[PDB]
Amino acid sequence: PLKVALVNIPLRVPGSDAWISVPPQGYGGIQWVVANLMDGLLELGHEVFLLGAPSPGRPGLTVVPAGEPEEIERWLRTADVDVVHDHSGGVIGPAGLPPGTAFISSHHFTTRPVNPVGCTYSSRAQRAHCGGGDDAPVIPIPVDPARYRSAADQVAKEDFLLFMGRVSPHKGALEAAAFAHACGRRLVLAGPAWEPEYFDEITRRYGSTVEPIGEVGGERRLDLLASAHAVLAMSQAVTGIWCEPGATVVSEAAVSGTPVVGTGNGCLAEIVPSVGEVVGYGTDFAPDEARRTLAGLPASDEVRRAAVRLWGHVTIAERYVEQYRRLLAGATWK
Amino acid sequence: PLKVALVNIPLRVPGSDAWISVPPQGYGGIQWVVANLMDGLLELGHEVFLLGAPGSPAGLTVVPAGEPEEIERWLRTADVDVVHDHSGGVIGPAGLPPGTAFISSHHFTTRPVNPVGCTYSSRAQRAHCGGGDDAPVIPIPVDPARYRSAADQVAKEDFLLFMGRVSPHKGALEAAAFAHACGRRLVLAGPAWEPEYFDEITRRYGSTVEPIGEVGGERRLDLLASAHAVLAMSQAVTGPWGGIWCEPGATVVSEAAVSGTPVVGTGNGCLAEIVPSVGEVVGYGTDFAPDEARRTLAGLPASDEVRRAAVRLWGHVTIAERYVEQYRRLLAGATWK
Ligand SMILES: O=c1ccn([C@@H]2O[C@H](COP(=O)(O)OP(=O)(O)O)[C@@H](O)[C@H]2O)c(=O)[nH]1
Numbered sequence: 233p234l235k236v237a238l239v240n241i242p243l244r245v246p247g248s249d250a251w252i253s254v255p256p257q258g259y260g261g262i263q264w265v266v267a268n269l270m271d272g273l274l275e276l277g278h279e280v281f282l283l284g285a286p287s288p289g290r291p292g293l294t295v296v297p298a299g300e301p302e303e304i305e306r307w308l309r310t311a312d313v314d315v316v317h318d319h320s321g322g323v324i325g326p327a328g329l330p331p332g333t334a335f336i337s338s339h340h341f342t343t344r345p346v347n348p349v350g351c352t353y354s355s356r357a358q359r360a361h362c363g364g365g366d367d368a369p370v371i372p373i374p375v376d377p378a379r380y381r382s383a384a385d386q387v388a389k390e391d392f393l394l395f396m397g398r399v400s401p402h403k404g405a406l407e408a409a410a411f412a413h414a415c416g417r418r419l420v421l422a423g424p425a426w427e428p429e430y431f432d433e434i435t436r437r438y439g440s441t442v443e444p445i446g447e448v449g450g451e452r453r454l455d456l457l458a459s460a461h462a463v464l465a466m467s468q469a470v471t472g473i474w475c476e477p478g479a480t481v482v483s484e485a486a487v488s489g490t491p492v493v494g495t496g497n498g499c500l501a502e503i504v505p506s507v508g509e510v511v512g513y514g515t516d517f518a519p520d521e522a523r524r525t526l527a528g529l530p531a532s533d534e535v536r537r538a539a540v541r542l543w544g545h546v547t548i549a550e551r552y553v554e555q556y557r558r559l560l561a562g563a564t565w566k
Numbered sequence: 567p568l569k570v571a572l573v574n575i576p577l578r579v580p581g582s583d584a585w586i587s588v589p590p591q592g593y594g595g596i597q598w599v600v601a602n603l604m605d606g607l608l609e610l611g612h613e614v615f616l617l618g619a620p621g622s623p624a625g626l627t628v629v630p631a632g633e634p635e636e637i638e639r640w641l642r643t644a645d646v647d648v649v650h651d652h653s654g655g656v657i658g659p660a661g662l663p664p665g666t667a668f669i670s671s672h673h674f675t676t677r678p679v680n681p682v683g684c685t686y687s688s689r690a691q692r693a694h695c696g697g698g699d700d701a702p703v704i705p706i707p708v709d710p711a712r713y714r715s716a717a718d719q720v721a722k723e724d725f726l727l728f729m730g731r732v733s734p735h736k737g738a739l740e741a742a743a744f745a746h747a748c749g750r751r752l753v754l755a756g757p758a759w760e761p762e763y764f765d766e767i768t769r770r771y772g773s774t775v776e777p778i779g780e781v782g783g784e785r786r787l788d789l790l791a792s793a794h795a796v797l798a799m800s801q802a803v804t805g806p807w808g809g810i811w812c813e814p815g816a817t818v819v820s821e822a823a824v825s826g827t828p829v830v831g832t833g834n835g836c837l838a839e840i841v842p843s844v845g846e847v848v849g850y851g852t853d854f855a856p857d858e859a860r861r862t863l864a865g866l867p868a869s870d871e872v873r874r875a876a877v878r879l880w881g882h883v884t885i886a887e888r889y890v891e892q893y894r895r896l897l898a899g900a901t902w903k
């Protein structure tokens with residue numbers, strides 16, 4: 233079995249000197265990746281060391297009290313692990329690691345990575361857009377069904393469409409509102425709204441469709457993912473040009489028995505069709521084609537099974553351990 | 567002489583359909599770099615075609631292509647010698663007519679889409695973006711004619727000035743901490759898009775900071791000119807861009823300096839390279855000893871000193887000319903990174 237350090241993106245609760253946790257109390261895509269990843273890792277019986285997230289006891293899991301990047305680099309210089317798995321985007325790197333420690337990253341950004349050697353990408357669209365070479369492995373966002381509402385949880389479906397993410401132009405909140413209005417359905421707008429003008433223009437334009445609820449967390453987040461009719465993942469090629477790297481909410485919605493309407497943006501082209509349908513860019517959604525797009529979305533059972541088949545936390549973590557071992561074997565790229 | 571197509575970063579005005587101009591109506595430093603460069607280029611006798619900024623004040627030609635598709639269609643048919651990208655690779659070399667040269671100014675913390683024919687505003691940026699030793703470094707240009715002069719005789723005021731996004735990596739908090747140490751006021755000019763951080767500042771340093779929100783036009787210019795110093799306190803903090811923050815070119819420094827205002831900054835990325843020309847580099851974080859920051863503040867150079875400094879190092883003409891040099895190199899068949 234491996235000892236594997238998971239370097240989470242080091243990040244402070246806004247306003248606080250407290251840390252954002254893995255998993256996160258609210259908004260936080262990468263911290264969710266690490267959490268369904270570490271769960272998988274541990275189920276495979278690997279030893280996990282959680283860094284950049286000083287956070288929640290389970291066997292095999294060590295939460296290192298290191299969050300400051302220099303606290304991490306220091307801890308990592310003397311750490312007795314086999315695999316440094318960076319999820320932070322290069323807050324730390326390969327140099328200064330003890331000899332025979334393998335370096336690996338999962339790339340979660342639209343920009344080219346600090347550390348392209350031993351880098352992995354959420355999608356082929358991402359790899360391409362970041363300049364990743366052909367032998368660079370593409371490994372999707374993983375999802376632990378245990379973190380999310382199951383069929384056994386008995387959460388009933390309701391009428392609304394759901395947006396969960398930052399209320400920002402590249403996330404397509406306005407386009408979500410335009411789709412939901414085209415279907416004659418409410419959009420619950422769950423997410424941090426930090427850009428006032430764009431928020432106000434959403435409500436000015438689709439005020440009667442959208443219900444803004446702010447950033448959400450814990451039980452509410454899971455109940456919302458579980459109950460929504462569809463989750464809207466409508467990222468837009470705006471200024472990068474925005475290419476969605478891995479689209480965290482697509483595995484969450486699907487694993488919560490919720491199908492997805494998204495765009496073909498970056499990674500959405502590759503994953504959305506497995507659990508829903510891809511629509512075009514913009515806000516010009518003809519109503520009946522839209523309601524028609526809604527009514528050919530799979531059922532809770534089929535998306536919940538596609539999620540696990542394709543992105544299951546154990547399956548995906550096994551795809552990573554095979555890389556860790558290529559690395560430790562003397563394998564490299566790119 | 568040359569016709570240079572200059573690609574601004576195409577961005578809509580928030581909540582509107584209209585475009586952010588060059589120079590920008592408010593906040594935006596790529597849009598100023600471009601404005602300041604265009605000035606230089608226009609002065610040196612070249613023809614400029616401004617893309618990525620339809621609707622801007624119009625030998626300049628402002629092209630009505632703002633959308634990247636709109637821009638790249640125009641580029642595919644234009645008769646220009648040089649395409650100069652400032653957008654971070656919203657467009658690229660492929661599909662330009664044969665013998666059009668490609669060059670970018672890299673304005674970002676992250677590695678560029680178009681590493682070939684890329685230039686960086688600072689050596690920290692180039693190092694940090696993985697740019698080769700052959701990739702020109704050419705800092706932010708400043709056109710003095712865009713700012714207050716000595717002749718303008720703007721009366722200096724007591725206050726310290728922050729001018730940027732009130733975000734953590736820009737160190738608004740730390741600037742408030744530095745102003746409080748000096749016993750001065752911090753005029754906090756800029757977009758506060760992040761409530762809790764901004765609430766964090768006002769909580770710790772409420773009698774120190776005067777938040778005014780975003781500014782432009784004549785208020786902006788006067789503020790740059792009347793401030794006792796400008797605060798450029800970027801922090802080596804982790805971010806949404808991914809990685810540690812590393813200030814690539816720090817446009818506000820050149821602005822301050824050419825306005826007769828000295829700068830107190832950190833050593834973050836480019837700052838280390840430009841701030842000691844026009845003021846003092848200080849430590850990261852909020853722990854400033856009063857008397858020592860007070861020292862730092864009274865030891866800063868005078869208006870005349872920094873203005874001579876800005877022009878000398880970052881003069882729009884002198885900086886546009888180092889670009890042209892790079893344009894001709896490319897058209898002559900040179901390459902790099
Ligand atoms: O109010 C919210 C909005 C979003 N999220 C979470 O934030 C992540 C969104 O990350 P994603 O990669 O989909 O969007 P991005 O982080 O790229 O903007 C997902 O885990 C969401 O469940 C949340 O917890 N509360």
Ligand SMILES: O=c1ccn([C@@H]2O[C@H](COP(=O)(O)OP(=O)(O)O)[C@@H](O)[C@H]2O)c(=O)[nH]1
Binds near residue numbers: 592755756817818
């Ligand atoms: O209220 C404001 C705040 C900032 N700025 C301008 O915003 C740009 C800040 O760019 P800088 O490179 O210093 O910081 P960054 O672009 O990385 O946020 C500069 O031109 C400032 O003069 C402005 O015009 N009004």
